Amino acid sequence: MENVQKKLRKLERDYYQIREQVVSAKAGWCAVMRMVKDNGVERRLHRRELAYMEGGALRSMSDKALGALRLAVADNEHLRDALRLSEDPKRPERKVQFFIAVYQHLRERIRQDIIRTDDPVDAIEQMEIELARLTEELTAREQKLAI
Amino acid sequence: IQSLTARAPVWLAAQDTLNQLCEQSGETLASSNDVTEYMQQLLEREREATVERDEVAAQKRELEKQIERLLEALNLERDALAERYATLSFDVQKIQRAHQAFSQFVGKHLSVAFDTDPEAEIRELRQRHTELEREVSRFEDQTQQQR
Amino acid sequence: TIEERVKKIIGEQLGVKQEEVTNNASFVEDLGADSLDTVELVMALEEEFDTEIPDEEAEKITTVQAAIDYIN
Amino acid sequence: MKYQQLENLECGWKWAYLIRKHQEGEPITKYIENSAAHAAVDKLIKLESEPVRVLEWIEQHMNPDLFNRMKQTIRARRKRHFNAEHQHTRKKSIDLDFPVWHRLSALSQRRGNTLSETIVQLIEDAERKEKYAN
Amino acid sequence: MKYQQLENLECGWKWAYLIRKHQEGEPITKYIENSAAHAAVDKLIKLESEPVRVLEWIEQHMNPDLFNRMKQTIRARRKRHFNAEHQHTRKKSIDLDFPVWHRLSALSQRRGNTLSETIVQLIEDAERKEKYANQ
DNA sequence: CCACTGTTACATTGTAACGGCA
DNA sequence: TGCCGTTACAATGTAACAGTGG
Ligand SMILES: *P(=O)(O)OCC(C)(C)[C@@H](O)C(=O)NCCC(=O)NCCS
């Protein structure tokens, strides 16, 4: 029975390790949850469809998205730097910051003179309107130049 | 729960696009009959807009030729026609884009659209696992003591 | 004093600040922490004080004040 | 294979490692003539943001003698990157005075244990002696 | 001061530190303007073979942030350079698993002594057991 | 007081040597 | 054998504490 007591002690130390894991995880979650509440988590990040997918596939999906972002963000330099920093696995919050750093940047370059939608996802429609208008202007300009 | 869990991811993704698609429109989709009704509203809007788009295009071409032969009043009208033509041009594009999403939405997700949330059942059934566990303990206790 | 532990940890586990919690309120509904969050809070309290709290006693911490009542 | 390998991550690791080595003066390329080496290094520098082509660059121009060092560096990077997620799998680095380290390594070699195992055993024996006395 | 300060060595150390920091991308300069920063870095590069002028370049263009890190790194480098002479003054680097290091650090903080002293005490108790077994 | 120096406890990255396994 | 995890270092950079003298 003393061996069973020692086994219980082993179980208790394993429990101690698991509890430390969980409490540290929540301590980390605190700030990321506080910052993501700027509409980030409402529907964008929390793709609840993925709640039933093993981390093995999620890692590959994030890796593929990172590969695409490398090419996409080549022109920008501050966004490139933020993406570079966001690869550390011991500073999770940085990833969310990058998302914010995108939207904020995507909000600065809106050229709000003729656009209003703060959310860039809805700025695509106004951009398409702008391209149509500019194509008509291009036709008019070409005719004037010819004459 | 093993069956329901396998059902959660497909259902969950299907409704998430619906809500995103719902946000793209001014109405709420909660039935197959409603979807067809809104789709026809979408299609009829499409036919009307192209008729008006063609109408304004006829007006623009006539005014463009009038200016070509030659004035400011003609330029002012042409600019107004370009503004109206652009405004109606995007309307046809958006309505066509909205229909395409609806067609794809019904092509793929119509099998599980507007269905019961399997997460709720999984939550309830899993809650029965624990409440069943009490029956395990309170019948294990009886056999431990009475013996 | 020693309560600074609890009134600190609570916030660190719920996203609220030290003074946000009110003794009259309840964690379950008046702080926004759901079942999982309250389990995490009680278990973090268990970790901090290097002690144990069974399920029955642990379930009696739904109110803010209780977190200190069993401690002191 | 214990840790899954991700291409867009390990390729960035390899590019960074090669750029670091080049900045340190190490000969990255197999070309003794300086012109070809400079051309290959420029190709690598402008090759940023590409896994599928940095792999080919390594296959084509990489110095033969650096393959083993790069492979083991990437091995260590992968293991550390995956282990740094949880506290218990991390490693704590300390500096020990040479006499103390000499004695500890003597014990570890004598008993066949590692430094971590040796310290665990020593602490456990100290605790057992405490309990004996107490 | 226990370690002799050598000017022509520490100046080279400082110059190398500045160059490493710059090539790593950090803003060693105190200038926000791009042109002045580039000119200052170029002058520092020219100062490669004149470590003596590096002190003046530091006082003229060094970022105010880096003084503490500078005084830390060169101080540590001096200590290490002078200790490397003899083995018995050297340091050995080892890696410890989190549980083992946690227990060891808790024990050391309990006894109020450094890690090497705690390891000495543990190995000395083990060696005392071995000695009394030997006698 | 204040600054400068010595020391310890980490982190960060790289490398060589073992040993397991297809 | 060649890849892959793992250990035990080396070299350098930093933060924090303890001393020392101006
Ligand atoms: P709620 O929807 O936040 O879910 C809470 C939970 C079921 C995930 C779980 O954290 C919980 O609160 N369980 C109750 C305690 C329990 O089940 N203990 C089992 C000990 S073996």
Which three-class secondary structure state does DSSP give residue A119? coil
Residue pair C5/C48 in contact by the 8 Å Cβ criterion: yes
Looking at residue E37, which CATH number applies to its domain? 1.20.1270.380
Q: In angstroms, what separates the C-alpha of B131 from chain A's closest C-alpha?
A: 24
Measured distance CA(E130)–CA(D107) in Å, rounded: 12
E61 plus E113 within the same structural domain: no
Q: Which numbered atom of ligand 1 lies nearest the CA of C38?
A: 12
How many whole angstroms separate alpha carbon E104 and alpha carbon E107?
5
Got the DSSP string for D55-112? HHHHHHHB-GGGHHHHHHHHHHHHHHHHHTTSTTT-EEEEEEEHHHHHHHHHHHHHHT
Instruction: List subunits contacting chain E, requiring 3 or more Cβ pairs under 8 Å.
Output: D
Based on the domain organization, do D18 and D73 belong to the same domain? yes
> A86 and A94 in contact (C-beta within 8 Å)?
yes
Q: What phi and psi values does residue A56 have, to the nearest 5 degrees?
A: -60, -45
E103 in the same domain as E81: no
Neighbours of C63 (CB within 10 A): 15
| Claim to verify: residue D121 and residue D75 sit in the same structural domain | no
Asked if residue E76 and residue E30 are part of one domain, the reply reads yes
Report how far ligand 1's centroid is from the alpha carbon of C36 (Å): 6
The distance in angstroms from the start CA to the end CA of chain B is 35
The answer to whether D100 CB is within 7 Å of strand F is no
Domain count, chain C: 1
Interface of chain C against chain A, CB under 8 Å? 12-13, 15, 40, 43-44, 46-48
The CA distance from D87 to the nearest CA of chain A, in Å, is 7
Resolution (A): 3.1
E2 within a domain of the structure (yes/no): no
- Using the structure, give the distance in angstroms from the CA atom of D127 to the C1' atom of G7, rounded to a whole number: 27
Residues D77, D102 share a domain? no
> In terms of CA atoms, which chain A residue is nearest residue D3?
A56
φ, ψ dihedrals at E93, nearest 5°? -95, 130
Q: How far is the CA of A35 from the C1' of G11 (A)?
A: 39
Gap between the Cα atoms of B139 and B145, Å rounded = 10
**One domain, residues E19 and E70:** yes
First-last CA distance in chain E: 45
Query: Does residue B53 contact residue B92 with C-beta atoms inside 8 Å?
Result: yes
Q: At which residue do the structure tokens 């059942």 appear?
A: B121
Residue at C21: amino acid letter: V
Instruction: Indicate if C34 belongs to the active site.
Output: yes
Supply the CATH number for residue D118's domain: 1.10.1220.10
Is residue D89 domain-resident? no
- Let me know: does A98 contact A82? Beta carbons within 8 Å: yes
* Residue A85 to residue A76: CA distance in whole angstroms: 15
- DSSP result, chain B: -HHHHHHHHHHHHHHHHHHHHHHHSSS---SHHHHHHHHHHHHHHHHHHHHHHHHHHHHHHHHHHHHHH--HHHHHHHHHHHHHHHHHHHHHHHHHHHHHHHHHHHHHGGGTTT---HHHHHHHHHHHHHHHHHHHHHHHHHHHHH-
Contact residues for D83 (Cβ-Cβ < 8 A; gap 6+): D89, D90, D91
State which approach was used to obtain the coordinates.
cryo-EM
For residue A87, the CA-to-ligand 1 centroid distance in Å is 33
Tell me whether residue D112 is in a domain.
Answer: yes
Q: Looking at the complex, does the CB of residue A18 fall below 8 Å from at least one CB of chain D?
A: no
Is the domain of E31 the same as that of E55?
Answer: yes
Number of domains, chain D: 2
Residues D23, D80, single domain; the answer is yes
Q: Are residues E128 and E104 in the same domain?
A: yes
- The residue of chain D with its CA nearest to that of E88 is D98
Residue E82 covered by a domain: yes
B75: tokens are: 């330029």
At B29, give phi and psi (nearest 5°). Answer: -100, 120
Distance CA E89, CA E111 (A): 24
Q: Tell which residues of chain A come right before a gap with C–N over 2.5 A.
A: none
The CA C37 to ligand 1 mean position distance, Å, reads 10
E122 within domain boundaries = yes
Residue numbers of the domain that contains D31 = 7-84
Distance CA E118, CA E108 (A): 6
Give CA D72 to chain center in angstroms.
6
Token digits for E83?
């200790």
